[PDB]
Amino acid sequence: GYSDRVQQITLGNSTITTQEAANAVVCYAEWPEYLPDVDASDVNKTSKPDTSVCRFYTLDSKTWTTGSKGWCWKLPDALKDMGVFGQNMFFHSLGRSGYTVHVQCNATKFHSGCLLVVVIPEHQLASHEGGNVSVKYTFTHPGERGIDLSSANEVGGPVKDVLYNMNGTLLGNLLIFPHQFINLRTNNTATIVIPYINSVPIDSMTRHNNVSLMVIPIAPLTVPTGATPSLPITVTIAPMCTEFSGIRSKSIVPQ
Amino acid sequence: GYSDRVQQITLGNSTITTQEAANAVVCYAEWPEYLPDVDASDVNKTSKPDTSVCRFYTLDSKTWTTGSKGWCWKLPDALKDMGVFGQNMFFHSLGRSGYTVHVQCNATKFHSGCLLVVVIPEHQLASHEGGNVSVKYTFTHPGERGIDLSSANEVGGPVKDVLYNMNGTLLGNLLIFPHQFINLRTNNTATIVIPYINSVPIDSMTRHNNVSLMVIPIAPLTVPTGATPSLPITVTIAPMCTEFSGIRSKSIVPQ
Amino acid sequence: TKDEVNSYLIPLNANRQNEQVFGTNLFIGDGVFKTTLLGEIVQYYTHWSGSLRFSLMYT
Amino acid sequence: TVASISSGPKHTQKVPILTANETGATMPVLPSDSIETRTTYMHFNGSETDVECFLGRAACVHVTEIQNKDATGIDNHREAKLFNDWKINLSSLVQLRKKLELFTYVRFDSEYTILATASQPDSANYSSNLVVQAMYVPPGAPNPKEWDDYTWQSASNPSVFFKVGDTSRFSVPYVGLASAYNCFYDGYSHDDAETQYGITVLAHMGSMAFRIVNEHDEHKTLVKIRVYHRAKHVEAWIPRAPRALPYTSIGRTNYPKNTEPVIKKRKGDIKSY
Amino acid sequence: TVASISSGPKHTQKVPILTANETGATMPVLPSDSIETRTTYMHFNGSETDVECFLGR
Amino acid sequence: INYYKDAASTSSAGQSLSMDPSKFTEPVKDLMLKGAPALN
Amino acid sequence: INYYKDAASTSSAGQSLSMDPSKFTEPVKDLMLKGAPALN
Amino acid sequence: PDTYTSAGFLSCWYQTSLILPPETTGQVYLLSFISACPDFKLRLMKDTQTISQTVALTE
Ligand SMILES: Cc1cc(CCCCCOc2ccc(C3=NCCO3)cc2)on1
Structure with missing residues (x-):
């Protein structure tokens, strides 16, 4: 009586149940694991807070309306302030982590709409100015708020044009990245497990984000007659196999 | 060529060397160890940050002068703000820890003076008011500053009379507690290893301090002629075998 | 202001408490490090990796 | 290897063509799951689509130019193209660039070919024979200042x-x-x-510098350098969506404003053929 | 080859970091004598620092 | 025959002949069998 | 393959792979053990 | 020196304080050394900014 459909994920002191899942994606078919010695470089023993950092943090909720263009969060940024995960983050020189991402959106059998939930490794954004204008730090570190693709261009911020993925590629091809759809008629959640993907064994958690999670409405939300025209979307994310190394004074970052 | 005299303690990412030690005391002849299952009650898996919390924090320095009466720090309070030790502390419901305490005071072969360095398990202080006046919270949670026994009585604070240990017992008998002397002529540091001592397996780190460390001048400081009449005393302390459990929202404590 | 035997000497003051003796960044190819044998060889190569040993002898 | 197996009529309870794309998978459906097929063999290996093959041919990555002329009274050799350099990079010319950016991380050895040809746009008695000396100047090396500095040693x-007229070829390990x-x-x-955002921060690999070794003749000679790059021993990870809009800068993803629609509009209906 | 071995807390009478430089030696002290380390391998031979290589271009 | 000492100097590599699209086409956590229902 | 008769005409030598810093880092007459006191 | 690639800082402070014996006075100095651990790797040889010249030397 197991269905692909019902699932439970327990991680730390927190549990999620979905009764309307559509399997789960594990990026590149690899599950998060700690850093092996053969791959290690820094000689420091690392710190593995385990259950105090590897639990589920639910970010603040978004509201899908008929005019929504899509939202974008960066990792580990989105979690920069969650509990002890965040403290560890500002206090060590280097850290590394994988995540379980669970995006939630329920409706009824009269609604229609379909969101794309995708994880993009190394999502370098484009400046809407063109040329070689850079995208300032603050703009690519929105924190739990994430970036709202239907917000206005700002100065020093990225471009927010959806048919171009914020980088000069077409929305249609985002499907080459680990992703899952939430089609109100099928699905009510999306779950993706992200292994740590980098060109170095461990890195800085503040100067470099290693994935952007993106939720994009593709088939517009259509509510039943005289229904309220909107649904909330909630994102809950859990660091998994986290390791921190090179402890010290506590980083100070712009803004 | 090993002497009782020279020592090195490396704990985490921090190391201490003393070239003029007088052995080291291990309270009640027991070395800090984690909490065994047979002794466990709370069902929660605990978090053991290891090297990020088990390193040496050096508190701010004191100044021994001919008029000094002695100083008193409480644990884990004194460390409530040190790095990730402190964060963990405010963020979990329960925690447990042992410590290595290293008290430092060097002079020259012309100085004289002798400090008592003692650890008192469950040091319940007395109100200087008498009767059944209580000692308010803030007063018994001085933080890294500790309590200065030569400061004035304050209201809601403890009594600071040294011949009575702040509790109705005589200074002379403090020697029944694990302790070590720093006699300028012999010694320049004192080191005590404290195992976790409580009547419960794990407790709250904020509502209850489980040891007071006390440094008390007993033979007054006497400097050579026309020397400056004072010496600094420094206290460095390292949590060891720390475990935190029952993570959540982050305690808010008076003042 | 001119090279002198004295820039090898880090001075120490009696009776100061809490204060700072010296500071430097660790760009081994520049600044204090640059004229040392280590600094001087590192400069023949583009990349370095490894641990450094910094010791202080008291006089 | 069979490209298709033989398969006949089906009337089952087992439907391989109905799936749920919401899952993120592309189910491996074949012609034989939905029509009746006959056996056929592949006759093919997919050799020429190997990433080593795809990134393994020489591509022009840079065209620069230097001239041989009397430096007498030139206050800025660099500025007179008495010698010139190049801030090495592989993203400046954009044919090879789109190919590499199909991947997120790439690892390979490089083989460089450098072709140098001379031009004599104004009246010369002859064509002189110049020797070029392109030299690699890594980060933290005395950058050269005149066309005949100690640097060139x-x-x-x-x-x-x-x-000039010939080609130089050598190969540099993955640096x-x-x-x-x-x-x-x-x-x-x-x-x-x-601080700048991108790879430009990252991929500062130092520059390459060219000069003519010859002193000057009576006329002036323009030498134009073309650097070709071939990846050998390629390793590529994490495929990404291909580049759709035009490029504007080395190292940023930025596209130009008021760009044009990249998807061709139908001449007709959705229903049109 | 290991570049660093794993090493944990220390509370000894054996202090490898105190020396006497007046002797003229450079004592071979390592990260693992004064912090807690994890194993890591060298992955490197020192090929390009051989004097034949240094003077050979 | 390599005429040169360093590995970078050798010619192009030879075909992976590796080929396994499943990390890209089927990264699902619970295995899907073609023919069985997608969602049970 | 050497094509030439004289030894000077051969290519570069091959890595010492000798490496022993102790003549430079520890030329002391009585052996010093790390961890033991420097001066006894 | 490069940012992305930067290595940190090194500082030194009084832990307690220097104390001179009687009949003694003034500043004392520390000598400081640097050498590389056996850990160390250097690669990709290049030319040093530490030496240059304007005309060839002669005897
Ligand atoms: C991606 C990507 C591609 C690159 C370029 C890397 C190549 C390494 C450095 O390139 C050279 C170029 C020229 C020479 C040279 N030596 C003598 C003449 O030319 C050496 C290394 O950087 N990032």
Whole structure:
């Protein structure tokens, strides 16, 4: 009586149940694991807070309306302030982590709409100015708020044009990245497990984000007659196999 | 060529060397160890940050002068703000820890003076008011500053009379507690290893301090002629075998 | 202001408490490090990796 | 190898063509799951689509130019193209660039070919024979200042001398600092509020510098350098969506404003053929 | 080859970091004598620092 | 025959002949069998 | 393959792979053990 | 020196304080050394900014 459909994920002191899942994606078919010695470089023993950092943090909720263009969060940024995960983050020189991402959106059998939930490794954004204008730090570190693709261009911020993925590629091809759809008629959640993907064994958690999670409405939300025209979307994310190394004074970052 | 005299303690990412030690005391002849299952009650898996919390924090320095009466720090309070030790502390419901305490005071072969360095398990202080006046919270949670026994009585604070240990017992008998002397002529540091001592397996780190460390001048400081009449005393302390459990929202404590 | 035997000497003051003796960044190819044998060889190569040993002898 | 097996009529309870794309999978459906097929063999291996093959041919990565002329009274050789350099990079010319950016991290050895041809746009009695000396100047090396500085001694820095009209060829191991080169980098060099964003911070591999060794003849001679790059021993990770809009800068993802629709509009209906 | 071995807390009478430089030696002290380390391998031979290589171009 | 000492100097590599699209086409956590229902 | 008769005409030598810093880092007459006191 | 690639800082402070014996006075100095651990790797040889010249030397 197991269905692909019902699932439970327990991680730390927190549990999620979905009764309307559509399997789960594990990026590149690899599950998060700690850093092996053969791959290690820094000689420091690392710190593995385990259950105090590897639990589920639910970010603040978004509201899908008929005019929504899509939202974008960066990792580990989105979690920069969650509990002890965040403290560890500002206090060590280097850290590394994988995540379980669970995006939630329920409706009824009269609604229609379909969101794309995708994880993009190394999502370098484009400046809407063109040329070689850079995208300032603050703009690519929105924190739990994430970036709202239907917000206005700002100065020093990225471009927010959806048919171009914020980088000069077409929305249609985002499907080459680990992703899952939430089609109100099928699905009510999306779950993706992200292994740590980098060109170095461990890195800085503040100067470099290693994935952007993106939720994009593709088939517009259509509510039943005289229904309220909107649904909330909630994102809950859990660091998994986290390791921190090179402890010290506590980083100070712009803004 | 090993002497009782020279020592090195490396704990985490921090190391201490003393070239003029007088052995080291291990309270009640027991070395800090984690909490065994047979002794466990709370069902929660605990978090053991290891090297990020088990390193040496050096508190701010004191100044021994001919008029000094002695100083008193409480644990884990004194460390409530040190790095990730402190964060963990405010963020979990329960925690447990042992410590290595290293008290430092060097002079020259012309100085004289002798400090008592003692650890008192469950040091319940007395109100200087008498009767059944209580000692308010803030007063018994001085933080890294500790309590200065030569400061004035304050209201809601403890009594600071040294011949009575702040509790109705005589200074002379403090020697029944694990302790070590720093006699300028012999010694320049004192080191005590404290195992976790409580009547419960794990407790709250904020509502209850489980040891007071006390440094008390007993033979007054006497400097050579026309020397400056004072010496600094420094206290460095390292949590060891720390475990935190029952993570959540982050305690808010008076003042 | 001119090279002198004295820039090898880090001075120490009696009776100061809490204060700072010296500071430097660790760009081994520049600044204090640059004229040392280590600094001087590192400069023949583009990349370095490894641990450094910094010791202080008291006089 | 069979490309298709033989398959006949089906009337089952087992439907391989109905799936749920919401899952993120592309189910491996074949012609034989939905029509009746006959056996056929592949006759093919997919040899020429190997990434080593795809990135393994020489591509032009840079065209520069230097001239041989009397430097007498020139206050700025660099500025007179008495010698010139190149801030090595592989993203400046954009044919090879789109190919590499199909991947996120890439690791390979490089084989460089350098073709140099001369031009004599104004009245010369003859064509002189010049020797070029392109030399690699890595980060933290005395950058050269005149066309005949001590720098050109290049006692520790690899340099090649070849003749204009000829070609020079040599191969440099993978010089990246990490395990792979980042084709993309969503980071900064540090957490400052105004520091550049991209790979440009990352992929500062030092520059290459060219000059003519010959002193000057009576006429002037323009020498134009073309650098070709071939990846050998290629390793590529994490495929990405291909580049759709035009490029504007080395190292940023930025596209031009008021660009044109990249999807061709139908001449007719959705229903049109 | 290991570049660093794993090493944990220390509370000894054996202090490898105190020396006497007046002797003229450079004592071979390592990260693992004064912090807690994890194993890591060298992955490197020192090929390009051989004097034949240094003077050979 | 390599005429040169260093590995970078050798010719192009030879075909992976590796080929396994499943990390890209089927990264699902619970295995899907073609023919069985997608969602049970 | 050497094509030439004289030894000077051969290519570069091959890595010492000798490496022993102790003549430079520890030329002391009585052996010093790390961890034991420097001066006894 | 490069940012992305930067290595940190090194500082030194009084832990307690220097104390001179009687009949003694003034500043004392520390000598400081640097050498590389056996850990160390250097690669990709290049030319040093530490030496240059304007005309060839002669005897
Ligand atoms: C991606 C990507 C591609 C690159 C370029 C890397 C190549 C390494 C450095 O390139 C050279 C170029 C020229 C020479 C040279 N030596 C003597 C003459 O030319 C040496 C290394 O950086 N990132």
